């Protein structure tokens, strides 16, 4: 029934309503709930330097209500890791590759927490990337994400030493996109497909190469 929608420059004309709704939800969740104060904005829209023409949003929709989601950004452009947290990837280096996209802003609205949505969101990043031929995603994450990744069968490669970011233990890592990982998650969520791609086809790897 309800699906995760892939929204990009090529199809956002079908989702302008939904995108604005998600920017406000990101403000409710990341700013007002999680107290990530560096992201507070007076328009009540949580929008940073990595929300631009090249961002891809994977948003969980129930009708037109956004109930969860995350975003992907090409590492061929300056990224959150390269610009804000390069010290977290000092051992292995910050990713920079059309085949590696930076994954951030994972959220689930309160009404949908501790339910089916979470594992669908995990499946969605794997499904979208495999479809696009993206090999890895990169992430800056709090260390409590590690068992969550492992629980979803995500293959994780740390890029550097964990460090305190504000008052929270944080690390940089890549996640390997795997058909095998996805197949198990499809079985677990009980759906052959979780990602809906309406409007024109997106060629993410090509776009990243242009950057
Ligand atoms: C990504 S781990 C969470 C931490 O990263 C910070 N963060 C997330 N996005 C950005 C950004 N675009 N610029 C600076 N800090 C960020 C948040 O304020 C939080 O402290």
XYZ file of N, CA and C and ligand atoms in Angstrom:
653
model
N 0.833 -1.236 0.000
C 0.000 0.000 0.000
C 0.848 1.258 0.000
N 1.215 1.716 1.197
C 2.033 2.922 1.370
C 3.500 2.661 0.999
N 4.105 3.597 0.271
C 5.439 3.403 -0.306
C 6.402 4.532 0.078
N 7.694 4.311 -0.175
C 8.723 5.347 -0.043
C 8.939 5.950 -1.425
N 8.767 7.264 -1.541
C 8.890 7.946 -2.830
C 10.273 8.552 -3.033
N 10.882 8.240 -4.177
C 12.156 8.833 -4.582
C 11.904 10.158 -5.290
N 12.366 11.244 -4.673
C 12.115 12.600 -5.161
C 13.455 13.265 -5.475
N 13.577 13.782 -6.693
C 14.813 14.403 -7.171
C 14.481 15.611 -8.040
N 15.510 16.231 -8.617
C 15.334 17.379 -9.505
C 14.413 17.054 -10.677
N 14.476 15.820 -11.176
C 13.718 15.445 -12.379
C 12.219 15.199 -12.147
N 11.808 14.994 -10.893
C 10.393 14.747 -10.600
C 9.784 15.571 -9.459
N 10.551 16.516 -8.913
C 10.089 17.271 -7.740
C 8.891 18.174 -8.032
N 8.675 18.474 -9.313
C 7.467 19.181 -9.754
C 6.182 18.426 -9.390
N 6.315 17.146 -9.040
C 5.179 16.347 -8.582
C 5.104 16.254 -7.060
N 6.039 16.908 -6.371
C 6.179 16.737 -4.926
C 6.489 18.018 -4.151
N 6.277 19.191 -4.749
C 6.649 20.432 -4.057
C 5.962 20.592 -2.699
N 4.681 20.215 -2.659
C 3.873 20.187 -1.442
C 4.516 19.308 -0.372
N 4.819 18.081 -0.771
C 5.399 17.060 0.098
C 6.791 17.478 0.603
N 7.601 18.071 -0.272
C 8.945 18.523 0.125
C 8.915 19.594 1.217
N 8.052 20.598 1.058
C 7.907 21.651 2.065
C 7.424 21.087 3.399
N 6.499 20.133 3.330
C 6.004 19.443 4.515
C 7.153 18.736 5.244
N 8.049 18.104 4.485
C 9.169 17.372 5.086
C 10.237 18.299 5.700
N 10.464 19.463 5.092
C 11.385 20.447 5.673
C 10.900 20.926 7.045
N 9.585 21.068 7.191
C 8.997 21.500 8.463
C 9.031 20.388 9.506
N 8.786 19.157 9.061
C 8.891 17.991 9.935
C 10.320 17.793 10.423
N 11.287 17.974 9.523
C 12.701 17.920 9.903
C 13.007 18.957 10.981
N 12.349 20.113 10.911
C 12.533 21.125 11.944
C 11.910 20.673 13.271
N 10.702 20.114 13.207
C 10.047 19.560 14.401
C 10.906 18.496 15.080
N 11.500 17.613 14.275
C 12.208 16.442 14.799
C 13.672 16.727 15.156
N 14.441 17.235 14.200
C 15.863 17.449 14.427
C 16.149 18.652 15.321
N 15.352 19.710 15.189
C 15.564 20.918 15.996
C 14.794 20.885 17.326
N 13.463 20.816 17.269
C 12.637 20.925 18.484
C 12.695 19.681 19.379
N 12.765 18.496 18.775
C 12.836 17.250 19.553
C 14.267 16.863 19.938
N 15.144 16.743 18.947
C 16.504 16.280 19.198
C 17.458 17.376 19.661
N 17.020 18.628 19.578
C 17.819 19.777 20.034
C 19.126 19.958 19.259
N 19.110 19.663 17.959
C 20.267 19.943 17.113
C 20.204 21.429 16.759
N 20.555 22.262 17.740
C 20.365 23.714 17.672
C 21.090 24.429 16.532
N 22.207 23.872 16.062
C 22.921 24.490 14.938
C 22.042 24.554 13.684
N 20.988 23.735 13.641
C 20.098 23.661 12.479
C 18.811 24.495 12.605
N 18.632 25.173 13.738
C 17.434 25.991 13.940
C 17.383 27.116 12.912
N 16.188 27.358 12.383
C 15.962 28.410 11.408
C 14.649 29.116 11.717
N 14.608 30.449 11.533
C 13.417 31.225 11.902
C 12.199 31.029 10.988
N 12.394 30.461 9.798
C 11.261 30.103 8.934
C 10.613 28.763 9.334
N 11.188 28.093 10.331
C 10.677 26.794 10.781
C 10.873 25.698 9.743
N 11.788 25.935 8.807
C 12.132 24.962 7.787
C 13.576 24.534 8.038
N 13.799 23.227 8.153
C 15.132 22.702 8.427
C 15.811 22.359 7.103
N 16.650 23.280 6.642
C 17.237 23.236 5.309
C 18.709 23.608 5.463
N 19.606 22.767 4.959
C 21.037 23.048 5.068
C 21.692 23.140 3.683
N 23.023 23.221 3.648
C 23.783 23.363 2.398
C 23.691 22.161 1.463
N 23.164 21.039 1.955
C 23.090 19.806 1.156
C 21.657 19.518 0.700
N 20.799 20.522 0.863
C 19.487 20.551 0.229
C 19.593 21.481 -0.969
N 19.888 20.916 -2.137
C 20.005 21.709 -3.365
C 19.489 20.907 -4.563
N 19.892 21.299 -5.769
C 19.432 20.660 -7.012
C 19.778 19.176 -7.097
N 20.856 18.768 -6.429
C 21.373 17.406 -6.577
C 20.960 16.416 -5.481
N 20.244 16.908 -4.477
C 19.754 16.070 -3.388
C 18.653 15.123 -3.881
N 18.658 13.899 -3.361
C 17.572 12.952 -3.575
C 16.929 12.679 -2.220
N 15.605 12.778 -2.174
C 14.853 12.524 -0.956
C 14.086 11.219 -1.114
N 14.168 10.370 -0.098
C 13.380 9.146 -0.052
C 12.390 9.305 1.087
N 11.152 9.648 0.735
C 10.144 10.018 1.728
C 9.013 9.001 1.809
N 8.767 8.505 3.020
C 7.652 7.603 3.299
C 6.356 8.396 3.264
N 5.461 8.018 2.355
C 4.185 8.723 2.189
C 2.984 7.836 2.513
N 2.019 8.411 3.226
C 0.702 7.804 3.404
C -0.288 8.789 2.804
N -0.716 8.506 1.578
C -1.392 9.508 0.767
C -0.379 10.591 0.450
N -0.609 11.792 0.974
C 0.352 12.883 0.820
C 0.993 13.288 2.157
N 0.691 12.542 3.215
C 1.329 12.759 4.512
C 2.715 12.106 4.542
N 3.733 12.908 4.858
C 5.096 12.401 5.076
C 5.167 11.798 6.477
N 5.481 10.510 6.572
C 5.557 9.852 7.882
C 6.982 9.439 8.270
N 7.912 9.611 7.345
C 9.304 9.274 7.592
C 10.127 9.515 6.351
N 11.441 9.350 6.473
C 12.307 9.505 5.318
C 13.778 9.692 5.625
N 14.540 9.917 4.563
C 15.963 10.225 4.636
C 16.377 10.829 3.307
N 17.640 11.244 3.197
C 18.129 11.877 1.971
C 19.514 11.394 1.560
N 19.798 11.558 0.273
C 21.051 11.137 -0.325
C 21.641 12.305 -1.104
N 22.959 12.448 -1.024
C 23.658 13.583 -1.630
C 24.947 13.079 -2.279
N 25.281 13.570 -3.491
C 26.454 13.007 -4.171
C 27.765 13.420 -3.500
N 28.682 12.472 -3.322
C 29.969 12.792 -2.700
C 30.958 13.418 -3.696
N 30.541 13.564 -4.953
C 31.340 14.304 -5.940
C 31.246 15.824 -5.735
N 30.280 16.259 -4.927
C 30.176 17.652 -4.471
C 30.731 17.738 -3.047
N 31.104 18.952 -2.577
C 31.408 19.091 -1.147
C 30.256 18.534 -0.293
N 30.602 17.744 0.716
C 29.610 16.988 1.470
C 29.677 17.343 2.945
N 28.697 16.888 3.720
C 28.745 17.087 5.162
C 30.029 16.481 5.728
N 30.401 15.292 5.250
C 31.629 14.662 5.735
C 32.880 15.458 5.357
N 32.999 15.840 4.086
C 34.183 16.573 3.616
C 34.299 17.969 4.235
N 33.165 18.640 4.432
C 33.170 20.016 4.925
C 33.069 20.150 6.440
N 32.190 19.369 7.065
C 31.878 19.555 8.486
C 32.632 18.571 9.371
N 32.763 17.327 8.916
C 33.321 16.282 9.767
C 34.516 15.515 9.177
N 35.446 16.201 8.463
C 36.487 15.396 7.807
C 37.403 14.671 8.795
N 37.499 15.190 10.018
C 38.305 14.563 11.069
C 37.781 13.175 11.455
N 36.494 12.923 11.215
C 35.903 11.613 11.496
C 36.294 10.546 10.472
N 36.872 10.967 9.350
C 37.264 10.035 8.295
C 38.758 10.115 8.003
N 39.546 10.519 8.996
C 40.978 10.740 8.797
C 41.755 9.466 8.468
N 41.288 8.321 8.968
C 41.984 7.055 8.735
C 41.861 6.591 7.280
N 40.633 6.515 6.778
C 40.388 5.990 5.435
C 40.166 7.072 4.364
N 39.831 8.289 4.786
C 39.545 9.385 3.851
C 38.061 9.572 3.564
N 37.651 10.818 3.316
C 36.264 11.117 2.950
C 35.971 10.586 1.553
N 34.827 9.900 1.388
C 34.418 9.423 0.066
C 34.243 10.562 -0.942
N 34.616 10.295 -2.190
C 34.394 11.213 -3.302
C 34.290 10.390 -4.586
N 33.070 10.032 -4.974
C 32.874 9.033 -6.030
C 31.419 9.066 -6.486
N 31.174 9.066 -7.820
C 29.798 9.015 -8.320
C 29.012 7.829 -7.745
N 29.727 6.771 -7.355
C 29.110 5.535 -6.862
C 28.951 5.481 -5.331
N 29.265 6.587 -4.664
C 29.061 6.706 -3.219
C 28.266 7.965 -2.936
N 27.125 7.803 -2.276
C 26.285 8.941 -1.932
C 26.154 9.064 -0.425
N 26.131 10.298 0.059
C 26.067 10.570 1.486
C 24.623 10.495 1.977
N 24.410 9.732 3.044
C 23.075 9.399 3.552
C 22.840 10.085 4.891
N 21.759 10.855 4.998
C 21.514 11.639 6.214
C 20.036 11.892 6.450
N 19.753 12.523 7.592
C 18.416 13.008 7.960
C 17.354 11.900 8.056
N 17.757 10.753 8.595
C 16.840 9.631 8.830
C 15.867 10.030 9.928
N 14.570 9.965 9.633
C 13.555 10.307 10.623
C 12.283 9.476 10.446
N 11.569 9.287 11.553
C 10.263 8.625 11.576
C 9.379 9.473 12.488
N 8.209 9.891 12.006
C 7.299 10.685 12.848
C 6.822 9.854 14.046
N 6.557 10.520 15.168
C 6.176 9.839 16.414
C 5.091 8.769 16.241
N 4.053 9.093 15.468
C 2.917 8.188 15.222
C 3.291 6.874 14.541
N 4.480 6.821 13.939
C 4.897 5.642 13.184
C 6.140 4.958 13.733
N 6.592 5.384 14.908
C 7.764 4.778 15.540
C 7.456 3.403 16.136
N 8.507 2.607 16.334
C 8.400 1.239 16.857
C 7.329 0.412 16.122
N 7.317 0.523 14.797
C 6.374 -0.207 13.952
C 7.053 -0.752 12.706
N 6.280 -0.907 11.634
C 6.774 -1.481 10.383
C 7.631 -0.510 9.563
N 7.415 0.792 9.752
C 8.059 1.801 8.903
C 9.586 1.751 8.933
N 10.162 1.552 10.114
C 11.615 1.611 10.241
C 12.367 0.679 9.294
N 11.976 -0.596 9.265
C 12.654 -1.569 8.411
C 12.403 -1.304 6.919
N 11.262 -0.694 6.603
C 10.969 -0.274 5.234
C 11.912 0.843 4.786
N 12.236 1.748 5.705
C 13.191 2.822 5.426
C 14.600 2.286 5.220
N 14.969 1.266 5.997
C 16.260 0.588 5.827
C 16.323 -0.093 4.458
N 15.249 -0.799 4.100
C 15.156 -1.438 2.792
C 15.201 -0.422 1.646
N 14.582 0.737 1.851
C 14.475 1.746 0.794
C 15.823 2.290 0.296
N 16.768 2.535 1.204
C 18.087 3.022 0.777
C 18.819 1.965 -0.054
N 18.694 0.701 0.347
C 19.297 -0.408 -0.386
C 18.657 -0.571 -1.774
N 17.328 -0.482 -1.832
C 16.588 -0.684 -3.086
C 16.880 0.427 -4.096
N 16.799 1.676 -3.637
C 17.052 2.816 -4.513
C 18.470 2.774 -5.072
N 19.454 2.579 -4.194
C 20.857 2.555 -4.617
C 21.172 1.401 -5.570
N 20.641 0.214 -5.283
C 20.863 -0.934 -6.170
C 20.269 -0.678 -7.558
N 19.064 -0.108 -7.593
C 18.417 0.271 -8.852
C 19.261 1.275 -9.645
N 19.901 2.203 -8.934
C 20.704 3.255 -9.564
C 22.149 2.835 -9.825
N 22.532 1.661 -9.329
C 23.901 1.189 -9.448
C 24.862 1.911 -8.516
N 24.331 2.525 -7.458
C 25.170 3.114 -6.405
C 25.725 1.973 -5.538
N 27.045 1.960 -5.333
C 27.721 0.845 -4.649
C 27.755 0.969 -3.124
N 27.846 2.201 -2.628
C 27.955 2.452 -1.188
C 27.250 3.739 -0.819
N 26.802 3.832 0.426
C 26.434 5.132 0.981
C 27.378 5.444 2.128
N 27.597 6.729 2.371
C 28.450 7.161 3.467
C 27.573 7.856 4.489
N 27.979 7.816 5.756
C 27.178 8.405 6.816
C 28.039 8.941 7.946
N 27.595 10.044 8.525
C 28.079 10.463 9.831
C 26.956 10.067 10.776
N 27.266 9.227 11.755
C 26.223 8.696 12.624
C 26.642 8.570 14.076
N 25.672 8.717 14.971
C 25.904 8.432 16.374
C 26.135 6.929 16.515
N 27.007 6.555 17.446
C 27.454 5.157 17.578
C 26.337 4.146 17.870
N 25.226 4.599 18.454
C 24.081 3.697 18.672
C 23.429 3.207 17.363
N 23.787 3.820 16.234
C 23.336 3.320 14.925
C 23.957 1.989 14.512
N 25.118 1.666 15.079
C 25.832 0.437 14.707
C 25.022 -0.862 14.884
N 24.417 -1.088 16.074
C 23.589 -2.299 16.186
C 22.337 -2.275 15.304
N 21.781 -1.089 15.060
C 20.637 -0.943 14.149
C 21.008 -1.339 12.719
N 22.166 -0.871 12.255
C 22.679 -1.275 10.948
C 22.870 -2.793 10.897
N 23.548 -3.336 11.910
C 23.821 -4.770 11.974
C 22.538 -5.600 11.968
N 21.538 -5.140 12.714
C 20.223 -5.791 12.786
C 19.527 -5.863 11.415
N 19.789 -4.876 10.556
C 19.213 -4.848 9.209
C 20.106 -5.544 8.185
N 21.196 -6.133 8.670
C 22.158 -6.826 7.826
C 23.040 -5.920 6.976
N 23.132 -4.641 7.340
C 23.978 -3.674 6.618
C 25.448 -3.996 6.856
N 26.229 -4.047 5.773
C 27.676 -4.252 5.849
C 28.324 -2.881 6.047
N 28.987 -2.694 7.187
C 29.464 -1.365 7.597
C 30.994 -1.293 7.638
N 31.557 -0.251 7.025
C 33.002 -0.019 7.038
C 33.310 1.320 7.697
N 33.835 1.298 8.940
C 34.246 2.532 9.609
C 35.351 3.252 8.843
N 35.281 4.581 8.809
C 36.258 5.394 8.066
C 37.286 6.083 8.968
N 37.068 6.028 10.276
C 37.958 6.711 11.204
C 37.598 6.432 12.640
N 38.258 7.131 13.553
C 38.005 6.949 14.976
C 36.699 7.630 15.364
N 35.883 6.979 16.214
C 34.738 7.684 16.802
C 35.232 8.875 17.618
N 34.401 9.907 17.709
C 34.730 11.113 18.449
C 33.455 11.741 19.001
N 33.605 12.516 20.067
C 32.489 13.304 20.572
C 32.139 14.419 19.591
N 30.869 14.489 19.209
C 30.350 15.605 18.425
C 29.242 16.179 19.288
N 29.471 17.397 19.770
C 28.733 17.943 20.904
C 28.949 17.030 22.112
N 27.901 16.356 22.550
C 28.009 15.494 23.711
C 27.697 14.057 23.334
N 27.813 13.751 22.044
C 27.404 12.445 21.531
C 28.532 11.782 20.755
N 28.799 10.525 21.097
C 29.780 9.717 20.384
C 29.310 9.466 18.957
N 30.150 9.869 18.011
C 29.798 9.915 16.597
C 30.938 9.301 15.776
N 30.601 8.755 14.612
C 31.587 8.149 13.726
C 31.214 8.370 12.265
N 32.166 8.099 11.375
C 31.935 8.129 9.940
C 32.161 6.729 9.409
N 31.334 6.324 8.449
C 31.384 4.973 7.910
C 30.783 4.926 6.512
N 31.096 3.871 5.768
C 30.305 3.546 4.583
C 29.443 2.323 4.861
N 28.344 2.233 4.124
C 27.511 1.051 4.100
C 27.566 0.487 2.687
N 27.874 -0.805 2.579
C 27.867 -1.504 1.295
C 26.435 -1.777 0.841
N 26.099 -1.338 -0.365
C 24.808 -1.676 -0.958
C 24.909 -3.099 -1.505
N 24.006 -3.976 -1.071
C 24.059 -5.386 -1.475
C 22.693 -5.929 -1.856
N 22.621 -6.567 -3.025
C 21.422 -7.304 -3.438
C 20.998 -8.301 -2.352
N 21.977 -8.998 -1.774
C 21.743 -9.988 -0.713
C 21.076 -9.344 0.509
N 21.627 -8.216 0.958
C 21.035 -7.432 2.045
C 19.587 -7.053 1.741
N 19.351 -6.572 0.522
C 18.031 -6.136 0.090
C 17.027 -7.295 0.041
N 17.468 -8.432 -0.492
C 16.608 -9.609 -0.641
C 16.051 -10.066 0.706
N 16.913 -10.105 1.721
C 16.503 -10.457 3.080
C 15.506 -9.431 3.631
N 15.782 -8.145 3.410
C 14.885 -7.077 3.867
C 13.527 -7.089 3.161
N 13.517 -7.395 1.864
C 12.259 -7.584 1.134
C 11.414 -8.686 1.780
N 12.060 -9.805 2.117
C 11.407 -10.911 2.829
C 10.878 -10.452 4.180
N 11.698 -9.699 4.908
C 11.345 -9.255 6.250
C 10.193 -8.254 6.276
N 10.157 -7.330 5.312
C 9.069 -6.341 5.239
C 7.827 -6.893 4.537
N 7.979 -8.048 3.889
C 6.874 -8.722 3.205
C 6.402 -8.004 1.954
N 7.337 -7.369 1.247
C 7.045 -6.625 0.019
C 8.196 -6.775 -0.971
N 7.878 -7.041 -2.254
C 8.929 -7.176 -3.264
C 9.574 -5.837 -3.641
N 8.910 -4.730 -3.307
C 9.364 -3.391 -3.679
C 8.827 -2.336 -2.707
N 9.714 -1.476 -2.210
C 9.316 -0.425 -1.269
C 9.475 1.001 -1.842
N 10.232 1.131 -2.930
C 10.505 2.445 -3.527
C 9.648 2.703 -4.765
N 8.877 3.785 -4.715
C 8.079 4.255 -5.840
C 8.804 5.407 -6.532
N 8.906 5.337 -7.860
C 9.583 6.381 -8.643
C 8.680 6.964 -9.737
N 7.868 7.949 -9.353
C 6.931 8.619 -10.260
C 7.598 9.716 -11.081
N 7.023 10.012 -12.246
C 7.575 11.020 -13.142
C 8.805 10.513 -13.871
N 9.571 11.430 -14.495
C 10.752 11.076 -15.286
C 11.798 10.266 -14.513
N 12.489 9.390 -15.238
C 13.536 8.533 -14.688
C 14.749 9.356 -14.258
N 15.269 9.057 -13.073
C 16.461 9.721 -12.564
C 17.714 8.890 -12.851
N 18.721 9.510 -13.463
C 20.019 8.855 -13.633
C 21.023 9.450 -12.642
N 20.983 8.946 -11.409
C 21.770 9.506 -10.307
C 23.279 9.487 -10.560
N 23.799 8.354 -11.027
C 25.242 8.215 -11.263
C 25.735 9.189 -12.342
N 24.939 9.356 -13.398
C 25.245 10.342 -14.439
C 25.286 11.754 -13.860
N 24.239 12.131 -13.122
C 24.187 13.432 -12.451
C 25.397 13.673 -11.546
N 25.791 12.647 -10.791
C 26.945 12.753 -9.890
C 28.249 12.954 -10.664
N 28.371 12.278 -11.807
C 29.518 12.460 -12.695
C 29.628 13.892 -13.225
N 28.483 14.504 -13.526
C 28.438 15.897 -13.978
C 28.935 16.851 -12.892
N 28.620 16.535 -11.637
C 29.160 17.259 -10.489
C 30.640 16.937 -10.317
C 25.138 13.952 11.649
S 25.477 13.579 13.343
C 24.490 14.792 14.151
C 25.238 16.103 14.367
O 25.582 16.693 13.108
C 25.118 18.048 13.068
N 24.743 18.415 11.683
C 23.841 17.819 10.872
N 23.788 18.443 9.669
C 24.681 19.450 9.699
C 25.147 20.514 8.780
N 24.641 20.645 7.532
N 26.100 21.365 9.230
C 26.633 21.274 10.466
N 26.252 20.340 11.350
C 25.306 19.423 11.030
C 23.958 18.137 14.050
O 23.844 19.448 14.621
C 24.350 17.106 15.090
O 25.133 17.725 16.116
